Amino acid sequence: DPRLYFENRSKFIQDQKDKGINPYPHKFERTISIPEFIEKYKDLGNGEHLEDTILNITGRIMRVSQKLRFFDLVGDGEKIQVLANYSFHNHEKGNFAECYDKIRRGDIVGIVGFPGKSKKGELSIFPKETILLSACLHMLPMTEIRYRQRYLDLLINESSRHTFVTRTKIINFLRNFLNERGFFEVETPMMNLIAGGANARPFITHHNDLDLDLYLRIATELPLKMLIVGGIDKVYEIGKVFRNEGIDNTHNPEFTSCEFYWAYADYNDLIKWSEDFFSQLVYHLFGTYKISYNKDGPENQPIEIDFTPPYPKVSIVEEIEKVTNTILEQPFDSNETIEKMINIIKEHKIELPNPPTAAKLLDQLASHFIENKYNDKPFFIVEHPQIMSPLAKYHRTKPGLTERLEMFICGKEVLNAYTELNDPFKQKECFKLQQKDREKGDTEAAQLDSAFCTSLEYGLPPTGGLGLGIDRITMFLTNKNSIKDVILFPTMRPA
Amino acid sequence: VDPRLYFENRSKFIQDQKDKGINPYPHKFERTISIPEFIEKYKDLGNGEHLEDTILNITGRIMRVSASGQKLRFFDLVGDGEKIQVLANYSFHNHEKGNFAECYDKIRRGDIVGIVGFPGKSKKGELSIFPKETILLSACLHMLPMKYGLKDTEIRYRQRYLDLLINESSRHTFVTRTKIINFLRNFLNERGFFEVETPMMNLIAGGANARPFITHHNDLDLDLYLRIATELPLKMLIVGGIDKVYEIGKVFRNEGIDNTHNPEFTSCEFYWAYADYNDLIKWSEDFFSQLVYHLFGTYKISYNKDGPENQPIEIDFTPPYPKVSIVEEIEKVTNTILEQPFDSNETIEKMINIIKEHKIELPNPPTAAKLLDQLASHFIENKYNDKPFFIVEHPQIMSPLAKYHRTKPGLTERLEMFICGKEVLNAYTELNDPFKQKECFKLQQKDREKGDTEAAQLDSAFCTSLEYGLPPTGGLGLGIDRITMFLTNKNSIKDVILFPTMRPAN
Ligand SMILES: O=C(NCC1CCCCC1)c1cc(=O)c2ccccc2o1
Ligand SMILES: O=C(NCC1CCCCC1)c1cc(=O)c2ccccc2o1
Ligand SMILES: N[C@@H](CCCC[NH3+])C(=O)O
Ligand SMILES: N[C@@H](CCCC[NH3+])C(=O)O
Ligand SMILES: [Co+2]
Ligand SMILES: [Co+2]
């Protein structure tokens, strides 16, 4: 019974206290970490002892096994054995049995001792003195607990640490990749008067002193472009954005994105950037371009994803048309075209979007016909209609379309990029269209950001911009089917 | 000369260019060299020297327009904070692309252009691009304000891009900000620390004494608080065995704006298992000294504490830095004895009287913690100006998350570093006894009931995590913005935040 175990440990602490002992000492000066210990002494011979090498080492006890006490000691994801021998015990410090009888699995300890190997060749610390540094009062397990008590996940599941180490490696790699190419990292506000730069529902909060409602950012696009106007010609931000919508395996309402803006680049530069970056990232982590991924569960058959460039480009209107044996004529929001798309939707028994605006219909069609086209490789969906893409520049040869690219891995979007719309005339127009779409009941529609439009009037150079979803990328590169598995503290309802 | 009319004429110009079949916003210009690279490559040409067979593509923003008769047009071209001259000579113009004068007459200050041309120096020895063809890439439709015409205005903060374009020091300030953060991240990574991200939205806002922002997730039907600190989940990661962990990112404090307060700001917090107070002081002295030396090549900086028009003072970041015990110091400068418990009637009355006589604001409610805090802020925090210093050994009632001092009853092992009277750093040996932790939370709660809306609220998830064993640990926080203010010579936090928090424009 856990409750009783805990009661007993609490009374152990209190009893230690009454008897004038400090069960939470302030400082233990260790001389070596456990990984460093393993590195330095793993070449010892069986039974060999370095008894004149006195070391101070700390760690968490994870195993407890009568003049010979055995323990497993863990630190920084690595483990050594603790071999307490009566014959080595410093008797001046207290009773051997009393000392080691008190130790429980989970306890954090400080050890003064020497390095050796057991006769069986197990690398070990041989204590002359062991000190309790911090007691574990519950029973450590030997579920939702992983997400609510991530510290348990990290202590017991060795794979957890590796997953988050990989996450941090991915972000380090991205930062270095951008910095080596002359990009300048900035911070832009997380609280805005207006939430823009994407089509999503915002979080709203309130500043008391200004008596002002503020929106948490849904993207970093607009202030970054404003910085390009300011002459920071290669600029980027890695940080949190917030989207007030439901939780599922590929959606957390706060997630980490990276956006960069690259003056004098366009669509083609961005496609090349994407292929270079993903192929190089994957090679950096694996030394190969092919990884395996369990798209449908940890014990079902994995598929192989090949990150060898180049990647397929699939124009969205043309592909929808081709797989529906239909023709979707412009204006895409004409009665005939809207009717046609609605009919395609109802015919294939897929959810009719509410409201059924042209953009929402197109997006639904793409979702159901295109986005799962390839699973064995990343691919781009390209040349999105202008009505789906209010911030992307019109396509230089294809009326009605834009110079946009979205990259997908196993049917999930991880990347969105385009040649940037930089004519303020056209931008105000796009904002008007977006708003009349909000008037139809579309609550994810873009609102007019006058500060941003004003900045366009001062001259935005031709520019290419790109956004990455760090969490989804991490999912694919650590073999997780749920985004909860790559965020340390995913958003959950109180227990 | 009217800006409105200027803008109307410019917009009409765009429309007419389109009508005449010209695209005034080209999709792609493929340049072959940047302006800094052009300067590096060709700055050593002799006067009057032309490299007329070296044809280059270059882009930039026009920042000056001048002419000389019919066949000479002069411009200043800027990019990446550096500047070259454009010398458009009729002699070199590619007449196949259009009329020379018509082409260059259209160009205005602020226009972004693409130039096909050759490098050279004028006979006066100005480094120049000599266009054969100049292409408009993006028009500036407003009149750009000129240098020093952008002072004493909010324009800098609402239209940061104008600040960046026009005031050269601006770029430098924000570059230095990014260099400081790079330096910090590298400093920690080289010492074995592991960078993580913890949630910005939480069921409870803990880890500091501050009023939070509140928001709402619709789908879970759930109120959430923006984080006021990163302390609690990072300590939970220490429990989890990530023994050197840190985060650099935004935190949110729902309070008023002034020269050292923006409602969102950037902090770094790190947690260091098996370290304590003394390690934290050393880390601080090492970090600040090495940072300053890395940016300046010296340990001493000048700082216009009182604005650009009054004399600067000099700050010496040469370690070590003075340590000042808070209670002993308040006692010493007020001729008082502040006996424990600090919340005792006698002691509270003593502090209320000290505050009354020195004519300083009385906190509401007058809890012992807030009184001591007010006394400290009035009497200690400006003890030194020519060097950073630490205030140390804060009472436990001021310090709900800090471990009791190992030899001094009622105190904690805490340190705060101040530069010119401003806190930039808060650190301590971490409280890792869950029993004591719940005690401190209950005390805080009783302060909350008595009107202190900044009191620490109980975080059961955190306390429960302490029950699994938090090793002895040292923790530390830095205010990136304030640090940057001191290292870029700014008196206002708005000057080091690209887009500081503001009310809506007209
Ligand atoms: O990774 C995500 N998206 C991929 C995007 C990210 C922004 C930059 C373009 C690529 C992503 C991740 C999410 O967790 C998420 C949650 C709610 C709504 C949308 C969400 O999107
Ligand atoms: O830099 C600031 N404080 C220094 C602290 C920051 C957290 C880590 C310890 C050091 C700071 C900066 C602010 O802008 C600010 C705004 C509102 C309330 C408090 C604010 O504090
Ligand atoms: N803001 C975009 C990413 C950048 C698109 C290119 N300007 C998004 O959230 O999808
Ligand atoms: N959370 C602290 C910084 C770290 C203190 C050491 N645990 C603050 O906001 O001041
Ligand atoms: Co989509
Ligand atoms: Co204070």
Author numbering:
A (entry chain A): 79 to 143, 147 to 223, 230 to 582
B (entry chain B): 78 to 583
Quoted from the paper:
Aminoacyl-tRNA synthetases catalyze aminoacylation of tRNAs with their cognate amino acids in two stages. First, the amino acid is activated by ATP to yield the AMP-activated amino acid, with loss of pyrophosphate, followed by transfer of the amino acid onto the tRNA. Malaria parasite genomes encode two different lysyl-tRNA synthetases (KRSs) that play a role in translation in either the cytoplasm (PfKRS1) or in the apicoplast (PfKRS2), while Cryptosporidium parasites and humans encode one copy. We present a selective inhibitor of both Plasmodium and Cryptosporidium lysyl-tRNA synthetase capable of clearing parasites from mouse models of malaria and cryptosporidiosis infection.
Compound 2 suffered from high metabolic instability (CLi > 50 mL⋅min−1⋅g−1 in mouse liver microsomes); however, in contrast to cladosporin 1, it was chemically tractable. The chromone core stacks between the side chain of F342 on one face and the side chains of H338 and R559 on the other. The ring carbonyl forms an H-bond to the backbone NH of N339, mimicking the N1 of adenine and the O1 OH of cladosporin. The cyclohexyl moiety projects into a pocket formed by the side chains of R330, F342, and S344 and the backbone of L555 and G556. This pocket is completed by the substrate lysine and is similar to that occupied by the pyran ring of cladosporin, except that the cyclohexyl ring probes deeper into the pocket.
